[PDB]
Amino acid sequence: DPWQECMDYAVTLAGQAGEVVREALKNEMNIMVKSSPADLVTATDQKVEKMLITSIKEKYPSHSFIGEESVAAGEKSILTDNPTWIIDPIDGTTNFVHGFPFVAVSIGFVVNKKMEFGIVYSCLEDKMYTGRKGKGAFCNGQKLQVSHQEDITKSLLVTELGSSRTPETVRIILSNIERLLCLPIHGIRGVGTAALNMCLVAAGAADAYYEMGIHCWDVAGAGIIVTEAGGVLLDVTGGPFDLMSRRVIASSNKTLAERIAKEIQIIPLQRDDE
Amino acid sequence: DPWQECMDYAVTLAGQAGEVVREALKNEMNIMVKSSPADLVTATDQKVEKMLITSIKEKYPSHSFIGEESVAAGEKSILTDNPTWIIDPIDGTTNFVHGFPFVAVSIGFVVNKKMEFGIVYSCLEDKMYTGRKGKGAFCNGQKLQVSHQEDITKSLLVTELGSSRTPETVRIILSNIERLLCLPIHGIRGVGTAALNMCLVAAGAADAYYEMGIHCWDVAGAGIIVTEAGGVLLDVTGGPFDLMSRRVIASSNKTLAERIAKEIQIIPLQRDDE
Ligand SMILES: [Mg+2]
Ligand SMILES: [Mg+2]
Ligand SMILES: [Mg+2]
Ligand SMILES: [Mg+2]
Ligand SMILES: [Mg+2]
Ligand SMILES: [Mg+2]
């Protein structure tokens, strides 16, 4: 089972990356700015990504890579049918900078443009989330299952305010939150990382997650965990989920997903493939 | 040391209450609503409260009690100088109903209308947060310390959307978030409970917490944990913290607290002592 060997190797690697992250948390940081004042990167993000990609590439030199900080350093963000590793070295950089205890290493493996396996390591909780097509979803060995609430007025939803600080954009995000909150729903949550918000849905701790402004690396590892736990992915348009589209609804079921799509106003964004 | 004997006993009872909450997560729930369609209560909330008060009262029958569900049943919430136990049997009922893993038992002990000790047990995490005036703040025996960021534009703030579903109320809460978000700040977080949001600030995982709409039982146990970890409490008016006012800023430092107070709009609220 070649993909299982890939996965086993990558789980070990994610563990090693999380040790690096924990040690760095206790040292002084170099906090740099990317696309907005709220879009942060540290030297640890960059170091961990280099560690991960150079290791995996050395072992699997014919595979392809899409990494967040690699793309920031000029690599192209193209998804082909070739086995592709989609890496977020630190999902929740802002959390890392503050010691907010939801910081993930995320690794997605994609073949024929379909998610095959995903690894999301919650570094500060020591929780290893895994999933693989046809194999189940787990947290530290415990099988994961989504909840089953088809009534949005009894749902607990998850989302984030995003790194944008452009007033028009922030206004639509908050207007989407206002619309949903007043349907009414039970509440909105978030822990400040897309991967771990999705893992909370996978585990049955909330009913659905949505966000616009994410990238393929934020969601590729957690997407298969959600679906192997029994959930569904959709685009915010109602159509099929598209990994390169910057948009996601990750839901325990289709009824909830389709309803959320109906209430959300779409923001404009640069696709990861343009 | 009389109050230490009170505290040691109450930590044992908090542990017992947390085991009751964890066993209830398993079984069917009776979900009732209180002050709004999103203000939930279960039989477990009511059970735990009665367990706590009957037990503490037998040991300390001259002391006073203020409990969330007792007040909901018609009891008064009068704070006198008499040693007073202020109890939130389950802080985060919505989280409890959904399995969102931040659910707390909160006990505050107040003497001469001053916080003396506080106990906040994170049930699903097995994290016992404690604090006593002149003794320090701890999580499972490890001393807590707030972080030190005096620049709000580099801050991570914590808050919640509230249980109100009244449009005019939700509009101000979201406007306050918009104002803060665009200062700009690094982000807003929350885990869906006042007491655990405050314990995250105590532990240095976020820079400050604010909310309007809370009650004395939401904050009495965590308040002393925040101040013994080196933080400060303030009213949103900039004045001293008032436990019965339905308003709180719990901050690592005074500079951030005062800036938050300057930026947000107050919502009118029925006091706990009116
Ligand atoms: Mg980033
Ligand atoms: Mg990242
Ligand atoms: Mg990310
Ligand atoms: Mg309540
Ligand atoms: Mg409560
Ligand atoms: Mg409460």
Residues of B in contact with A178 (CB under 8 A): 170-171, 174
Q: What φ, ψ does residue B224 adopt, rounded to 5°? A: -70, -25
Catalytic residue set of B: 68, 88, 90-91, 93, 218
B153 and A181 within 8 Å at the Cβ level: the answer is: no
Pairwise CA distance, residues B18 & B119, whole Å: 12
A191 and B191 within 8 Å at the Cβ level: the answer is: yes
Pairwise CA distance, residues A163 & A182, whole Å: 24
Pairwise CA distance, residues B39 & B63, whole Å: 29
Residues of A in contact with B38 (CB under 8 A): 184-187
Please tell me the distance in Å from B189's CA to the nearest CA on chain A: 7
C-beta of residue A217 within 8 angstroms of C-beta of residue A108: yes
Distance from the alpha carbon of residue B139 to the mean position of ligand 5, in angstroms: 21
Q: Evaluate the omega torsion of the peptide bond into residue B37 and state whether it is cis, within 30 degrees of 0.
A: no
C-beta of residue B40 within 8 angstroms of C-beta of residue B31: yes
Residues in chain B: 274
From the annotation, which residues of B make up the binding site?
68, 88, 90-93, 192-194, 211, 218
Class of residue A55 by CB neighbours under 10 A (exposed 0-12, middle 13-18, buried 19+): middle
Interface test with B, best of A29, A98, A144, A145 (most B CBs within 10 A): A98
Pairwise CA distance, residues B124 & A75, whole Å: 42
C-beta of residue A29 within 8 angstroms of C-beta of residue A37: no
Class of residue A244 by CB neighbours under 10 A (exposed 0-12, middle 13-18, buried 19+): middle
Find all residues with CB under 8 Å of A46, minimum gap 6, and list them: A69, A73, A89
Domains of chain A, by residue range, sit at: 1-144, 145-274
CATH of domain B145-273: 3.40.190.80
| CATH pick for A145-274 out of 3.40.50.1000, 3.40.190.10, 3.40.190.80, 3.30.420.340 | 3.40.190.80
Q: Is some CB atom of chain A closer than 8 A to the CB atom of B178?
A: yes
CATH topology of domain A1-144: Fructose-1,6-Bisphosphatase; Chain A, domain 1 (3.30.540)
Q: Is A215 helix (H, G, I), strand (E, B) or coil?
A: coil
Find all residues with CB under 8 Å of A161, minimum gap 6, and list them: A170, A173, A174, A190, B177, B181, B187, B188
Those of residues 72-91 in B touching chain A at CB distance below 8 A are none
Q: What is the 3-state secondary structure (H, E, C) of A22-88?
A: HHHCCCCCCEEECCCCCCEEEHHHHHHHHHHHHHHHHHCCCCEEEEHHHHHCCCCCCCCCCCEEEEE
Distance from the alpha carbon of residue B214 to the mean position of ligand 4, in angstroms: 10
Pairwise CA distance, residues A89 & A41, whole Å: 11
Q: Is some CB atom of chain A closer than 8 A to the CB atom of B147?
A: yes
Find all residues with CB under 8 Å of B134, minimum gap 6, and list them: none
Those of residues 212-271 in B touching chain A at CB distance below 8 A are none
C-beta of residue A267 within 8 angstroms of C-beta of residue A246: no
Pairwise CA distance, residues A119 & A225, whole Å: 8
> Which of the 8 DSSP states describes residue B240?
B
* B-chain residue closest to A100, CA distance: B205
Asked how this structure was determined, the answer is X-ray
Pairwise CA distance, residues A181 & B167, whole Å: 10
Catalytic residue set of A: 68, 88, 90-91, 93, 218
Instruction: Return the amino acid letter for B258.
Output: E
* B-chain residue closest to A93, CA distance: B186
Please tell me the distance in Å from A171's CA to the nearest CA on chain B: 8
Please tell me the distance in Å from B89's CA to the nearest CA on chain A: 20
B189 and A192 within 8 Å at the Cβ level: the answer is: yes
Pairwise CA distance, residues A69 & A67, whole Å: 6
Q: Is some CB atom of chain B closer than 8 A to the CB atom of A101?
A: yes
Pairwise CA distance, residues B10 & B17, whole Å: 10
Distance from the alpha carbon of residue B81 to the mean position of ligand 5, in angstroms: 24
Q: Is B200 helix (H, G, I), strand (E, B) or coil?
A: helix
